[PDB]
Design a protein around this ligand. Structure first.
Ligand code: SF4
Ligand code: SF4
Ligand code: SF4
Ligand code: SF4
Ligand code: SF4
Ligand code: SF4
Ligand code: FES
Ligand SMILES: [Ca+2]
Ligand SMILES: [Ca+2]
Ligand SMILES: [Ca+2]
Lengths: 196, 145, 127, 377, 154, 754
């Protein structure tokens, strides 16, 4: 229930609500209001900060507000004192040129490692994080791997008589934004969805 | 003198020798690390066995472990990730352990069956004897160096 | 029935006649295609006399003047078929117990076939 | 005095004295890059990448990703699929706990109890080779259900191991509860505060070892775990003693689940027959053109699930586990991020062994049960 | 215990085998689907046109070159799965550790069912003059590996 | 413009728009089988069905979105169950008789049938799904039967779109294919066996399925397995857009690349089937002469031996001679290198006596909106694709509206079987040209004689009636275009008069140069100077060659560096230093189109060997002479072109030039401009690239030449054996030789050796 109170609130306050039929619901917060508004969330009974995950929409078909975007997952654990089970995600589109964003280390200690990762893989900084140091990628790895314009870094696989295979040019699979091997693509391969 | 019988039969006895004083010094990484513990449990070290994905961060480290080893030494590579680039053909992994240390035997599989790691050292073994060749048919140097 | 089995047996024959006429009158025989229900048969069984399903007696340029085919084992309303391309002539041969290979009531003997083949070769071959 | 002690985890233990100042971990040594390369594979192809992160209770990873994609493009897993998928899931959970329990048997000396646990494990892995033809990384879970049905010799053998385990799990609880050394070795160290654990995200079943009742399989039910005889083990105060027991208590229950699901195992289909999500029954590939086309297409460029972003939490032996997938309507995912339980679990380690002795710092980390392919990935 | 053979289950993932129909034809029609489905880009296939006089496979098309880089190969049996003829099936051999990287790419005649042992197992028994003792046994040969002779006495 | 609501999206769109293109423009979709970019829509297969409302009042029967026009305030539903159910069925019908070849079928995963099958087929109703309803004997016929050496036809696959047959009557105008019987039995067939038209290859790129297939690349790789490399064909001046498929360092197949500004989606056969030679026999290591024979040598070794033959050399005796397809960069470098290295003789292989930069380049766009076409040469050979634009021109077609998805799927502008106007063009050439068919005003002349016809046109003489009707046409001509080629551009006289005719009337021109990058090398100044020595003139003493010149130009010279790509016999007998060079396929750099457009060149991953582009070799041979060159690599050479202010890709470079260096014509033989190039005679192209020899049956048999004889002939450009053909259109007593080179449009001495 502690979630309806989040919605009834966001509804009034011009906060856009996303929702897919499967059970996951978002709530975009603009840049400014994020910092404080989120603190308010924990204050509201949001125990546990499960995940945080950076996204890069550079190669995404349908355009988006700003290039990168970060999701968080606030929850009220049902094994505690008055925990419902109210889980939900919250999103924030972060400008391609201003990778800045306030840490959440303040209220959650989980964001310690998690914010570090999202800095490591995508270029996103975090205002006031104890130490913004590379977590996963070797020290001398220049740049940020997980973002779409960073080469996956593949070697051609090798075979006998100078037969090679550059996977990138061999894949039969289609990258959404890719037209396909015919002139175009349509129908149940622009996306499919069965009906329960 | 080096190519005479006297020297040869010596070095052929010497080799046959440490062909059994082989001291498997495992250097496991991911999933392969858990399938090698199922062969060393069934029963200064040369012969380090690389078993798992060699990260690029982990690379300069295994490197040192190898350097600071005796001189008569060998390197088996365990499974896809060690041997080849594995199935992870990316920025995060080395595409052949031979890039950092010289490999004497490769052992395919993922993870290779334990019983195959056995057969694998048997190959290493029967090679330090200088008793092993490749498909082209050439005699193979017992040490990688 | 098991007349199905006999049909394919006859189709093997019809092919043997074709190969004969081919090397005989100096004109190209060609297997056009093999049964899909063989190619993509996997562990599944197969006890048919051949793999060959569509065949032709082509001319100098390759253009066929006779076309014979039998229906795949897994199909319905089975028939072995003759077709003189370009000349709108289609023959459907069935199989009757004791009588033999027939196109309706009339038997399809090596004689009758060879006749058809010639008429076609002489009038319909381009080279 | 900074001592640099460094599974495939490096620790910077700042330490003047015999206490422990702060433990500053440095991982990244098993960074294989999964999250990036999966953005370059079929949704089918990805099922081979999923068991290679938590190589112990891998199946939980398989199911976690399968569920996320299933919902996304909306498919329905048959009766017998869902059933097999928990018999398979929990059978693997036992495998990951057998290891954890086994490494705690050595640090306790008990060496014949260990020579058993390593045999148990191998008997479970024998089962995975019966059905999926692999010791692990089994390509069995499919987006619609499972690659193929289980063999004749799976039901019998699962009975053998599902018969000697009942009292056997108690024997393991026995040795650790009647704690000779164990009491004095763990009972106090590794203080996990019930309300700081829920601050660092120590969700991994070592959460409940310190007094929380948050098991995802009950909290936010998934593959029909919603319908089972289910006991969530609890711990009194967040030490390491409790953490070694809780995880043994979990085996008691996972076995009940296996027994209970094995009962409702009636014959049928194994994957959703819907042609847009599933390749055509092997056999008619010799008749239907539509079949040949679908098959040829299905294995070359995979299916295309709708645009959108989904996520669904499951619980591996190491805690909450979820795949957050971003589909752009392509043959491959646009983004996959993995909620690695052992990654967030590892933040509750500086605190875990804060100011404790140092010889205690081994069984202090091992009682958190991190798997490096999980944290790193 | 390399003195007493290992007993693998029927379904084990071992060195790939290329199967034939009873007709003597190679089941494989050089379609390159197996390769297209490989998660490690471990298969290279060059197809070629059959010779109506001296066939190889049933189609108009067969596999001139079929190579599998046994190092890259992760043994998923996704290839066996995608194959639409049942030509490539996962064998039993696993004793295949070898010396030079490139000696580990298996060729067509390294995998046909009428082959016994692995690339190195054979190579040894060549300059040895002593037959190939496969270090494994199974309950039975899979149906799908029809033709593949192996130690099955159970 | 018109208001049209697709499903939930509303879109503006010109009046004569296809409901289909409406849908795609809005960003939707519909099963598309028979309609095609640039071909007449007919509602044949019936896949692009939709529902239509038009007031909401729902039309009773579904419509063929590809042949129904848009109207103001029109709703077009493409999602209703009623619709899906219909497409589903239509697909079922298409698959009903198909052959089950996919895994074995060369159409790979690039097949319109598969995709749409998966895309729309198998209807979801609202139990064990049924993949196939039809359990009867499929249609069995002919299979894998090659129409020519370049196209292999599989009748069984064909779905009876009308694409191929329709294409033939429309684009090339050569009806050599068409359905045979009727009903379920109809099929594609021919009675013109060779597949005559020089534009057959395109049916391979249109055919929705695997019926019409590129035999040149049969059974090499599956379509995804290929490594695509978009680039430009530089066999001739039109610079069509191509894609080169390559796998493991060998060139497998060539295809068209859509580039509507220039060539549309079409490619001549020579461009598409003449790739046999590139990846086959080739020179892979630099050679230098030791003991009166050439031997492999390192580039290190070569460079020193290069220094040696040039130590004793005065910087004016240096000769630089590029290839007809030298990049814009290779030309700019060779320019400055001959600037600092004060020399007069630098030239390029195909150099026209009359610089094409003379005439103002005319866009292919302009050609369609012009009002008359005065042609002096055979477009079908000199610049093939022109033929195809002139086909659109003779149909009064004009550049289609661009939509959100570019060039339109169903252009209602194009009706099937259109009438071709013969009053829109005039064709003058040394033979019965192919496009003489759509030319009312048309006449045959004899070699190098355009000079007098061009004169007549000006108004200073009397020519035939034809030339007269041509004059009066060009007179009453509002905004015409002059197309002229070999003879015209190769003889100062005519060339000059041509320019004049085109200055007086404010009209643009199409230079059908025999040099691929002619207009581009001319802009860089790779033209000989005052002195003399041109590409066929043996003047200079120390020279660099980018091709095999006439034997006469080699014999004598002191030092010769041949930067060939294949070992020519003339090289291994006259060359001092031979270095390996890349083909245009594997190069990098820009070119200048015959319309002045600049087109890119990408590098295919073919087997270079140890070769490098003239960009290096030039710079290297610049050191062994004195001055360090200004150009190292491409990234840096770019700066020097962007310096001269040459536009980026696709832009057109305006550049005139008034200067002409004439030469006499030894009128015995005429090297007849041909589509195919000489160096293409390999594999399947082996025959279509053999030289020919024409003559009038009287003079033909008067010089003892049977109607089907294999004859040996000698020109200053070399000895070649050629078929001999009788032709009543060939002026009496001259002999037409297949000028397979870029030395076409030339009159030469020579004879038939016996
Ligand atoms: S080779 Fe296989 S089992 Fe071994 S580390 Fe790599 S993915 Fe894991
Ligand atoms: S088992 Fe897997 S990795 Fe090996 S060839 Fe088959 S698909 Fe590729
Ligand atoms: S093994 Fe099978 S999938 Fe692979 S090329 Fe041969 S027929 Fe095709
Ligand atoms: S034309 Fe297309 S659908 Fe037909 S067999 Fe060929 S690849 Fe398959
Ligand atoms: S051959 Fe191809 S392009 Fe021609 S009608 Fe048949 S399907 Fe259409
Ligand atoms: S017309 Fe010219 S540029 Fe175009 S494909 Fe042919 S030779 Fe090449
Ligand atoms: S009906 Fe064939 S595309 Fe419109
Ligand atoms: Ca080759
Ligand atoms: Ca034929
Ligand atoms: Ca070639």
């Amino acid at each position: 229930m502690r979630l309806e109170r989040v919605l009834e609130e966001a509804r009034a306050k011009g906060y856009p609500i996303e929702d897919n039929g499967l059970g996951n619901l978002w709530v975009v917060l603009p840049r400014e209001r994020f910092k404080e508004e989120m603190a308010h969330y924990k204050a509201m009974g949001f125990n546990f900060l499960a995940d945080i995950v950076g996204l890069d929409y550079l190669t995404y078909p349908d355009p988006r507000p700003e290039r990168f975007a970060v999701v968080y997952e606030l929850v009220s654990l049902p094994g505690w004192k008055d925990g419902d089970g109210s889980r939900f995600f919250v999103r924030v589109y972060v400008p391609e040129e201003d990778p800045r964003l306030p840490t959440v280390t303040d209220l959650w200690g989980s964001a310690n490692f998690l914010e570090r990762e999202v800095y490591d893989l995508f270029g996103i900084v975090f205002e006031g994080h104890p130490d913004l140091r590379k977590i996963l990628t070797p020290e001398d790895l220049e740049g940020h791997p997980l973002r779409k314009d960073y080469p996956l870094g593949e070697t051609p696989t090798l075979f006998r008589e100078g037969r090679y295979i550059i996977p990138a040019e061999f894949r039969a699979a289609l990258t959404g934004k890719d037209p396909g091997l015919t002139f175009y693509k349509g129908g149940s391969r622009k996306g499919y969805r069965s009906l329960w | 003198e080096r190519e005479g019988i006297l020297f040869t039969t010596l070095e052929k006895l010497v080799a046959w020798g440490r062909s059994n004083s082989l001291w498997p010094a495992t250097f496991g990484l991911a999933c392969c690390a858990i399938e090698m513990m199922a062969s060393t449990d069934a029963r200064q070290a040369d012969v380090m066995i690389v078993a798992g994905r060699l990260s690029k961060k982990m690379a300069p480290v295994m490197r040192r472990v190898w350097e600071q080893m005796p001189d008569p030494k060998w390197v088996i590579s365990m499974g896809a990730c060690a041997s080849s680039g594995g199935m992870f053909n990316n920025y995060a992994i080395v595409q052949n352990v031979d890039s950092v240390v010289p490999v004497d035997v490769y052992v395919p599989g993922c993870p290779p069956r334990p019983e195959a790691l056995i057969y694998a050292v048997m190959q290493l073994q029967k090679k330090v004897r200088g008793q092993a060749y490749n498909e082209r048919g050439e005699r193979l140097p017992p040490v990688a160096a | 029935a098991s007349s199905e089995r006999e049909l394919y047996e006859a189709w093997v024959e019809l092919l043997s006649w074709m190969r004969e006429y081919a090397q005989a009158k100096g004109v190209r025989f060609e297997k056009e295609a093999d049964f899909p229900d063989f190619i993509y048969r996997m562990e599944r069984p197969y006890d048919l006399p051949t793999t060959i399903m569509t065949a032709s007696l082509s001319d100098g340029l390759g253009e066929p003047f006779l076309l014979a085919d039998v229906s795949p084992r897994h199909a319905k309303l089975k028939r072995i078929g003759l077709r003189l391309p370009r000349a709108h002539i289609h023959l459907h041969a069935h199989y009757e117990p004791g009588k033999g290979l027939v196109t309706g009531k009339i038997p399809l003997t090596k004689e009758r076939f060879f006749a058809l083949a010639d008429r076609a070769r002489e009038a319909l071959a381009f080279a | 005095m900074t001592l640099n002690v460094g599974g495939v985890l490096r620790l910077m233990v700042t330490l003047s004295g015999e206490e422990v100042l702060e433990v500053v971990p440095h991982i990244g040594y098993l960074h294989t890059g999964f999250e990036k390369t999966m953005e370059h594979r079929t949704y089918l192809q990805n099922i081979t990448y999923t068991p290679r992160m938590d190589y112990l209770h891998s199946f939980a990873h398989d199911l976690a990703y399968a569920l996320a994609v299933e919902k996304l493009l909306g498919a329905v897993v048959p009766p017998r699929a869902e059933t097999i998928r928990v018999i398979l899931n929990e059978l693997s959970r036992l495998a990951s706990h057998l290891v954890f329990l086994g490494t705690g048997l050595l640090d306790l000396g008990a060496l014949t109890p260990f020579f058993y646990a390593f045999r148990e494990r191998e008997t479970i892995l024998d089962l995975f080779e019966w059905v999926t033809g692999q010791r692990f990384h089994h390509n069995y879970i499919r987006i619609g259900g499972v690659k193929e049905d289980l063999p004749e010799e799976f039901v019998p053998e699962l009975k053998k191991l599902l018969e000697v385990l009942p009292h056997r799990i108690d024997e393991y609880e026995a040795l650790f509860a009647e704690s000779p050394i164990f009491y004095e070795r763990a009972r106090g160290v590794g203080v996990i505060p019930p309300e700081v654990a829920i601050d660092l995200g120590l969700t991994g079943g070592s959460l409940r070892a310190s007094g929380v009742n948050y098991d995802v399989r009950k909290a936010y039910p998934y593959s029909g775990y919603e319908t089972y005889t289910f006991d969530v083990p609890l711990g009194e105060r967040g030490d390491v003693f409790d953490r070694m027991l809780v995880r043994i208590r979990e085996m008691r229950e996972s076995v009940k689940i296996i027994k209970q699901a094995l009962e409702r195992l009636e014959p049928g289909p194994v994957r959703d027959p819907n042609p847009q999500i599933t390749p055509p029954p092997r056999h008619l590939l010799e008749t239907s053109m539509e079949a040949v086309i679908y098959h040829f297409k299905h294995y070359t460029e995979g299916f295309h699930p709708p645009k959108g972003e989904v996520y669904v939490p499951t619980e591996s032996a190491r805690g909450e586990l979820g795949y957050y997938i971003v589909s752009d309507g392509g043959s491959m995912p646009y983004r996959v991020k993995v909620r690695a339980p052992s990654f967030v679990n590892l933040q509750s380690l500086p605190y875990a062994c804060k100011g404790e002795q140092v010889p205690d710092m081994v069984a202090i980390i091992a009682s958190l049960d991190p798997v490096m392919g999980d944290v790193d990935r | 215990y390399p003195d007493a053979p290992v007993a693998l289950k029927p379904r084990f993932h071992g060195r790939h085998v290329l199967t034939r129909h009873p007709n003597g034809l190679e089941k494989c029609i050089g379609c390159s689907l197996c390769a297209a489905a490989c998660p490690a880009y471990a298969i290279y296939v060059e197809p070629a046109e059959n010779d109506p006089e001296n066939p190889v496979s049933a189609g108009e098309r067969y596999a001139k070159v079929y190579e599998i880089n046994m190092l890259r190969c992760i043994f998923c049996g996704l290839c066996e799965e995608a194959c639409p003829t049942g030509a490539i099936v996962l064998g039993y051999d696993f004793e295949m550790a070898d010396y030079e990287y490139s000696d580990l790419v298996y060729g067509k005649e390294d995998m046909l069912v009428d082959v016994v042992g692995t690339k190195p197992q054979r190579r040894e028994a060549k300059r040895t003059g002593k037959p190939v003792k496969v270090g494994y046994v199974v309950p039975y040969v899979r149906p799908e590996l029809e033709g593949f002779k192996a130690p099955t006495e159970g | 413009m018109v208001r049209v609501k697709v499903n939930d999206r509303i879109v503006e769109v010109p009046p004569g728009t296809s409901v289909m293109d409406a849908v795609f423009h809005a960003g939707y979709d519909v099963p598309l089988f028979c309609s095609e970019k640039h071909l007449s829509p007919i509602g044949a297969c019936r896949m692009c069905l939709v529902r239509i409302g038009l007031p909401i009042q729902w039309q009773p029967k579904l419509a063929a979105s590809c042949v129904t026009a848009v109207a103001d305030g029109m709703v077009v539903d493409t999602l209703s169950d009623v619709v899906r159910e219909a497409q589903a069925g239509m697909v079922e019908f298409t698959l009903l008789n198909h052959p089950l070849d996919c895994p074995t079928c060369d159409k790979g995963g690039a097949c319109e049938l598969q995709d749409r099958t998966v895309e729309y087929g198998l209807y979801e109703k609202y139990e064990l799904p049924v993949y196939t309803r039809f359990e009867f004997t499929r249609r069995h016929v002919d299979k894998h039967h090659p129409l020519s050496p370049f196209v292999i036809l599989d009748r069984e696959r064909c779905i009876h779109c009308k694409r191929c047959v329709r294409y033939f009557e429309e684009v090339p105008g050569d009806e050599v294919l068409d359905f045979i019987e009727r009903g379920v039995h109809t099929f594609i067939g021919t009675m013109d066996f060779g597949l005559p038209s020089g534009f057959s290859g395109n049916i391979t790129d249109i055919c929705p399925v695997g019926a019409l297939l590129d035999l040149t690349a049969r059974f090499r790789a599956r379509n995804w397995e290929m490594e695509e490399t978009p680039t430009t064909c530089a066999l001739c001046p039109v610079g069509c857009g191509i894609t080169a498929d390559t796998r493991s360092g060998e060139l497998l197949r060539i295809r068209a690349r859509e580039v509507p500004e220039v060539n549309e989606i079409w490619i001549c056969d020579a461009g598409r089937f003449g790739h046999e030679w590139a990846d086959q026999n080739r020179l892979k290591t630099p050679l230098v002469r030791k003991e009166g024979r050439l031997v492999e040598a390192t580039w290190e070794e070569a460079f020193l031996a290069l220094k040696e033959g040039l130590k004793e050399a005065r910087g004016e005796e240096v000769g630089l001679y590029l290839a007809h397809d030298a990049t814009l960069e290779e030309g700019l470098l060779a320019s400055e290198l001959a600037k600092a290295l004060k020399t007069p003789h630098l030239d390029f292989q195909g150099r026209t006596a009359a610089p094409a930069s003379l005439f103002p380049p005319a866009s292919l766009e302009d050609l369609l909106q012009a009002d008359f076409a005065l042609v002096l040469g055979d477009p079908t050979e000199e610049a093939p694709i022109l033929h195809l634009r002139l086909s659109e021109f003779v149909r009064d077609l004009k550049p289609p509206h661009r939509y959100n998805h570019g060039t339109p799927f169903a252009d209602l502008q194009i009706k099937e079987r259109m009438p071709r106007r013969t009053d829109k063009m005039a064709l003058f050439a040394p033979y019965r040209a192919p496009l003489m068919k759509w030319a009312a005003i048309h006449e045959v002349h004899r070699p190098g004689e355009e000079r007098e016809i061009l004169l007549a046109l000006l108004g200073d003489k009397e020519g035939s009636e034809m030339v007269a009707k041509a004059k009066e046409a060009w007179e009453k001509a509002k905004n015409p275009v002059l197309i002229l080629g070999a003879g015209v551009l190769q003889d100062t006289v005519a060339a000059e008069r041509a320019r004049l005719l085109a200055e007086r009337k404010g009209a643009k021109v199409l230079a059908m140069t025999p040099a691929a990058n002619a207009r581009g090398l001319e802009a860089m100044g790779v033209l000989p100077g005052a002195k003399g020595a041109s590409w066929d003139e043996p003047g200079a003493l120390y020279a660099y060659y980018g091709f095999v010149p006439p034997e006469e130009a080699l014999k004598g010279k002191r030092f010769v560096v041949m930067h060939l790509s294949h070992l020519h016999p003339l090289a291994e007998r006259y060359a001092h230093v031979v270095l390996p060079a890349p083909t245009f396929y594997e190069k990098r750099g820009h070119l200048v189109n015959l319309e002045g457009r600049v087109l890119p060149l990408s590098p295919a991953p073919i087997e270079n060997g140890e070769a490098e582009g003239a960009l290096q070799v030039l710079a290297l041979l610049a050191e062994a002479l004195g001055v360090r060159p200004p150009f190292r690599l491409h990234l840096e050479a770019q700066k020097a072109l962007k310096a001269r202010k040459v536009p980026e890709a696709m832009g057109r470079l305006s550049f005139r030039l008034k200067e002409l260096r004439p030469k006499e014509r030894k009128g015995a033989f005429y090297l007849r401009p041909t589509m195919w190039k000489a160096h293409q005679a390999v594999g399947k192209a082996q025959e279509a690239a053999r030289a020919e020899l024409w003559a009038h049956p009287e003079t033909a048999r008067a010089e003892a030449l049977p109607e089907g004889a294999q004859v040996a002939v000698e020109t200053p450009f070399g000895r070649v054996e050629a078929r001999v053909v009788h032709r009543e259109d060939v002026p009496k007593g001259h002999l037409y030789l297949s000028a397979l080179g870029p030395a076409a449009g030339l009159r030469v001495e020579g004879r038939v050796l016996v």
